[model samples]
Target: MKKVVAVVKLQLPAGKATPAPPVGPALGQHGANIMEFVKAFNAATANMGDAIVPVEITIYADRSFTFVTKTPPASYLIRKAAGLEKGAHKPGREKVGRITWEQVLEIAKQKMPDLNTTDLEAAARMIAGSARSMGVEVVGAPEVKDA
Candidate 1:
């Protein structure tokens, strides 16, 4: 039967290929080819600079596999944009940093394809929510009157 044997989730740096612990062990457990996966992942993420990529690999019982990658997490993007080391411990009552709504728009655009939403506005709403949870204000956004 053609069935999924294992599903591995990994967060790796773009363009950095290695048969390291996480990569080797996860694939090895499922009898997937390690070097091949590494090369393909590195090649695909070559132009992504230093962004962290979250990859999901589904290994079949036949030892064949397929993978998909997602962009860096929203929290990481917000932290980088806001120049903050971490999110506010108390979110609403505490403030950590701020970013412009335009920046939120740009990030939303970058993440749109991976997102569940079909439009930029919906993606922006999701990103805005992430920013708020991190205590990062989306400046120049008058729509959030009480948030």
Candidate 2:
């Protein structure tokens, strides 16, 4: 059997995997073929556009490896929805941008598989919390929209 030698997890930008710095050093230290890994990673993420991809790489004893990709961080997705380069420094006191309920649900749906909760609404609330923490507003609330 090809025994598992190491497991590495890293957050990398989609479609831009390179044999440099973080990627190169990490894999090189583990005895994995950095170029082979980068090639596969870039190919897999090529159509993903701009997003941070969290990948888990499983390296076998023979230096062969495989990886699994996860959804981008909720904060990054929320920032994109709000059209912001970064979050507010004074999160609670200063408001940066607004995102609607529909967008929250969409993000929730996309993050469902990776999220802790199985309920859609719960996932949406979690994403909303992430938005709020970054000083982003959540508009179109179901209960307060009429008022």
Candidate 3:
């Protein structure tokens, strides 16, 4: 029976992996090695700054396990780009901050692979929606992407 036995989801900080609590309690019973996951995760994200990375863990029946990590959410990126500590107070009525279309492109490019569509235009639309929801203004024009 050589198939994936389990899947675990984790949010680990960049370059700071641990074998305690969350990682330990969750994967230990399945014979998953904590140190291995910690070491591997930290190794891959050594230079990723201090972002919270989303990781997907795959555990095999033989007790072996592997993981794949992805970038943080788009909202976080938008907040960083807009220099805001958080999103708007009243999204629809109150505005928190503003970010340019170029910044939107940057976020789109970063999140493209994890998104539903591979097209940059699609990513742009996705980010734009996120920006609007967060009450962050998108500077300049729109044309499936800025001009």
Candidate 4:
């Protein structure tokens, strides 16, 4: 441990990093250089476009920092795939949107780096579960349900 100054986490819109509000107030309190972090974060996530990118930042006593970016939330990915702005308020009952198993697989592949499992099918199942919770129906499946 290099005398950790602060460990800050944030979920921000990709490619839109700015030293504003949550970013500034959060990092400033930790004595980390805000503008430098903003520039670096923006550049790093520039290719992600509209997706939400969750970041984990570690600031050392020297005022230097490092951060890791994670894939967007499953709900967000699911909504985008379904072309929706939001999930259903009553996710278990009301129908909000729909997505194909293939789309679920793709989302799982993208989420592999963060997901706990290595198997694509397992990962896809997790994504499918997320879809269902968000009231987004899955068009195709392997026919087994996990309890």
Q: For candidate 1, write residues 25-60 as lDDT tens digits.
A: 656755646776777767655533455766667777
Compute each candidate's TM-score over C-alphas.
0.47, 0.46, 0.47, 0.46
Decide which is better by lDDT, 2 or 4: 4
Q: List the residue pairs that clash in candidate 4.
A: none
What TM-score does structure 4 among the candidates reach? 0.46
Note the Cα lDDT for every prediction shown: 0.68, 0.68, 0.66, 0.69
Which residue segments of model 2 deviate by more than 4 Å?
Answer: 1-21, 27-72, 85-95, 114-116, 145-147
Model 4, total clashes: 0
Candidate 1, superposed: residue stretches over 4 Å from native: 1-3, 29-31, 74-124, 127-147
Selected candidate, larger TM-score, 1 vs 4: 1
Model 3 steric clash total: 0
lDDT of candidate 2 over 53-141, digit per residue (tens): 66667777777666566336565556567644333344455455678888988988888886468887788888887777756788666
Show the lowest summed lDDT stretch of 10 residues, model 1: 83-92
Top model number, lDDT: 4
Measured with C-alpha atoms, the lDDT of residue 138 in candidate 3 is 82
